[PDB]
């Protein structure tokens with residue numbers, strides 16, 4: 001599961017869960033390798049946000065039902081996403097509906113001002129995505145492949161590291 005590429009994987013989804021819960025789209029490329037993480041946060045401003053208005057009728061069917069208000073309502077979902085991925089589609093655009101589901105669950109966790117429940121929500125997506133793509137994200141570089149399949153808002157090109 002974990003790799004040196006995982007410092008560029010989890011840093012896309014833990015930062016976009018905070019784009020919709022706290023407004024933070026990031027301005028400083030992320031820990032270790034993170035120039036691809038900056039490029040992917042630019043892209044999710046349109047491709048992630050467009051799915052918060054196309055599939056959010058199904059997100060409320062799993063957030064009024066689950067009423068996610070703890071880290072225990074999130075760590076129980078790390079079994080579920082094994083069966084949602086498998087191949088996950090190699091266009092990477094089908095994974096965006098789980099990333100924008102997680103960003104709307106993170107917004108319901110900021111209605112009660114929690115944040116230690118949104119750290120395991122990024123892992124319930126991404127640590128389980130690199131369980132089912134334990135060599136396929138490593139081979140395809142699927143986080144750059146996500147930016148190359150859209151590029152709709154990465155016209156700034158991301159990159160140029162700051163802080164860590």
Ligand SMILES: O=C(NS(=O)(=O)Cc1ccccc1)c1ccc2c(c1)N(CC1CCC1)C[C@H](c1ccc(Cl)cc1Cl)O2
Pocket residue numbers: 055058062066077080084094095097098101
């Ligand atoms: O690749 C996907 N594709 S998509 O979502 O864009 C397919 C779709 C098509 C039409 C309408 C809504 C989604 C995709 C991504 C994420 C998903 C799912 C599919 N499913 C099936 C979806 C069709 C019914 C919802 C649900 C799954 C999930 C989330 C949370 C919990 Cl508690 C349980 C489950 Cl099972 O998350």
